[PDB]
């Protein structure tokens, strides 16, 4: 089950900052268009909102308003948002993400990086 | 070769 992010955190932790930064630049390439900004991947994807918005921007979806919570007020809502974002990733043709939606909400860095990198790999050429 | 591949994407 072991991947490159396991190897990164175990053996090359000083390479984490360039990994963060490249992914931050990628997400803000799209989120800036909505006047939104990510400063830190540790916490700012946990409520599931930006992941949903990002998928809308990347695939050009008509995202149904009643399919996610724009201002989630609980663990469970934040849980429905990430799951819906995962749903939209798979709708575009991506494999089901490795992390459970709860791992994102609980601010697991590896899980956050994995989800964002797989979007980077697919959508790095999208203007 | 996964870490090599990962860093070629994100160190470019």
Numbering used by the authors:
A (entry chain A): 246 to 372
B (entry chain C): 2 to 13
Per the authors:
To elucidate the molecular basis for LD recognition by α-parvin-CHC, we cocrystallized α-parvin-CHC with peptides representing the high-affinity ligands LD1, LD2, and LD4. All three LD motifs bind to the same binding site on α-parvin-CHC formed by the N-linker helix, the N-terminal part of helix A and the C-terminal part of helix G, which is consistent with our results from chemical shift mapping. Inspection of the resulting difference maps unambiguously confirmed that LD1 is oppositely aligned to LD2 and LD4. Because of the reverse binding orientation D+1 of LD1 faces away from the binding site and toward R247 and H256 in a symmetry-related copy of α-parvin-CHC. On the basis of the probability of the solvation free energy gain upon contact formation, the latter interface is probably an artifact of crystal packing. Although our PRE experiments suggest bidirectional binding in solution, the refinement of different models against our X-ray data strongly indicate a predominance of the forward binding mode in the α-parvin-CHC/LD1 crystal.
The adaptor protein paxillin contains five conserved leucine-rich (LD) motifs that interact with a variety of focal adhesion proteins, such as α-parvin. It belongs to the highly conserved parvin family that shares a common architecture composed of a variable N-terminal region followed by two CH domains (Olski et al., 2001). Our results demonstrate that full-length α-parvin contains a single LD binding site, formed by the N-linker helix, helix A, and helix G of the C-terminal type-5 CH domain.
